[PDB]
Amino acid sequence: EVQLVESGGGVVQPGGSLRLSCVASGFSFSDFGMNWVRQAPGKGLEWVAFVPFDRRINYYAESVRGRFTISRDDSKNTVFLQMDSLRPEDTAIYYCAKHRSQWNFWPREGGLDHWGQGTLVTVSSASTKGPSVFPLAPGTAALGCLVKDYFPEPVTVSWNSGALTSGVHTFPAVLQSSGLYSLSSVVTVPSSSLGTQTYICNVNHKPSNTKVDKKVEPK
Amino acid sequence: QSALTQPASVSGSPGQSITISCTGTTSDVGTYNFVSWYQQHPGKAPKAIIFDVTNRPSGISNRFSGSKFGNTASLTISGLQAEDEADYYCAAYTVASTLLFGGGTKVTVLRQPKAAPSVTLFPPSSEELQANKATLVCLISDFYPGAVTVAWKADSSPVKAGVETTTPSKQSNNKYAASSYLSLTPEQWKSHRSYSCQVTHEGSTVEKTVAPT
């Protein structure tokens, strides 16, 4: 079976550099071109670069040209992606992908026949930083907690120490233009309970040993 | 240099047929028969289903097929099955010797009723304002199929500065939820008469507005 295993992804500051690897087996590595394709989380695929089976010319997407450098070492069945001058918009999962057609010098005939599971690269200039928790105040009602400006992932959110589970939804985090994460957790509840029942969100941010409890109230 | 154009969302019943389109220019799709399609299930790597417009790798059901006409390539899935639910991506070889991916299409195999989103728009809390920051939170819930687009209005003018939207994921009740954030300064928040969150779902639009009162 074809195997493609990417690695090397992690956190790196804007303007910095980072080098991804892809180790391959299950086919004659030296006879095929290779590609890197990237995907910012919950967004579309974007082709990054191609290196042909034998030295000639590497091709790059306009958005990475001059900053990124693809290459390979046949002796270890490895493709590399050297990323310099990283920008925040480079945050993405990077997949390594074998080219289908044998002995091709362009990423042309056949498309990309096999892809690895990918490696995540986060471009932020930030360190361990605890969330600030703000209430989202409310026959049904929506109420919640805004979990703002933390790094890195993840936080976890419970309601009423776990007793409340129905109608709960913790969204996925968004990485902001500031290099920090924010998420929301929401509960839908009976309007008629707003005066009587106590709603507390429990926000756990392990990377900083921070727990925050926030009672959220009408008005 | 922008992605090939694909419909955001396409849906059909089990048993039915759907076609996704992929539209380029003479710079890629119009000139070259090297268009490939890929299937990606949530959290999984993409998997190749169609290459060179029409060809199918071994192992790929032949309910899948592809065609091209001018600047538009097409993927066709017949005898729709639950497992066909996924995102679909086209890609075309260009004149620059690059590979250009389309924007992707969410393909839903319909297993529950169409549901319009409920939208709740939260103004910044008072506490956040005390911290010199202001975030409008737009909570979008209970929709099916799971694809929306969100637009923000300041008073009556469009705004896309400091917007951050998550992509729909499943809720506990098996429908979809999404969220969008508008970050701005307390000055901005207090200056305008109102702000509005606009959610578009299956050609329909629902709007919520908040005012500093």
Numbering used by the authors:
A (entry chain H): 1 to 52, 52A, 53 to 82, 82A, 82B, 82C, 83 to 100, 100A, ...
B (entry chain L): 1 to 9, 11 to 27, 27A, 27B, 27C, 28 to 95, 95A, 96 to 106, ...
Publication excerpt:
Multiple VHs and VLs were obtained, but only one VH, named 19.3H-HC, neutralized the founder Env when combined with either of two highly related VLs. The two R880F mAbs produced by combination of 19.3H-HC and 19.3H-L1 or 19.3H-L3 are hereafter referenced solely by their VL designations. To interrogate the antigen-binding site characteristics of R880F mAbs that influenced their distinct neutralization profiles, crystal structures of the 19.3H-L1 and 19.3H-L3 Fabs were determined to the resolutions of 1.7 Å and 2.7 Å, respectively. ODA analyses indicated that the antigen-binding sites of 19.3H-L1 and 19.3H-L3 were very flat, forming roughly rectangular shapes approximately 15 Å wide and 30 Å long on top of the six CDR loops.
